[PDB]
From Swiss-Prot:
Gene transcribed to yield this protein: LYZ
Residues that coordinate or bind substrate: 101
Catalytic activity as recorded in UniProt: Hydrolysis of (1->4)-beta-linkages between N-acetylmuramic acid and N-acetyl-D-glucosamine residues in a peptidoglycan and between N-acetyl-D-glucosamine residues in chitodextrins
Superkingdom: Eukaryota
Note: Lysozyme C is capable of both hydrolysis and transglycosylation; it also shows a slight esterase activity. It acts rapidly on both peptide-substituted and unsubstituted peptidoglycan, and slowly on chitin oligosaccharides.
Annotated protein name in UniProt: Lysozyme C
Length: 129
């Protein structure tokens, strides 16, 4: 599924991401836009053996298990396929862990390069949450 900006904002709010660990909702919607173009099925297979999965492009080396990645930690304790659902719950649950395990949103390169220091409130402007 390909979400709309406000559609996604609302879904993320319902799932507790607004102000989660000091990151306002705009940050999360901005990250999703530049990581996956709001596409829940986005997959990026990297030359290093790992794959990035879903709307938040969560990596299979540290966070989910795809059975094909060397050094897998599976710190979200989920199969990576769960991250490809149209229901964002697994991706949000895992994202909460990622930001939690001492990284901040710098875990997402698209956030660091395209959202950080910008006016992220713009990503939720006009939206009914």
């Amino acid at each position: 599924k390909v979400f709309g900006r406000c559609e996604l904002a609302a879904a993320m709010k319902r799932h507790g991401l607004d102000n989660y660990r000091g990151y306002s909702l705009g940050n999360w919607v901005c990250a999703a836009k530049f990581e996956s173009n709001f596409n829940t099925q986005a997959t990026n297979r990297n030359t290093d053996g790992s794959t990035d999965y879903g709307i938040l492009q969560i990596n299979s080396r540290w966070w989910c298990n795809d059975g094909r990645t060397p050094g897998s930690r599976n710190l979200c304790n989920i199969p990576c396929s769960a991250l490809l659902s149209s229901d964002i719950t697994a991706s949000v649950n895992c994202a909460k862990k990622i930001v939690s395990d001492g990284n901040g949103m710098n875990a997402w390169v698209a956030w660091r390069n395209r959202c950080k220091g910008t006016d992220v409130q713009a990503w939720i402007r006009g939206c009914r949450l």
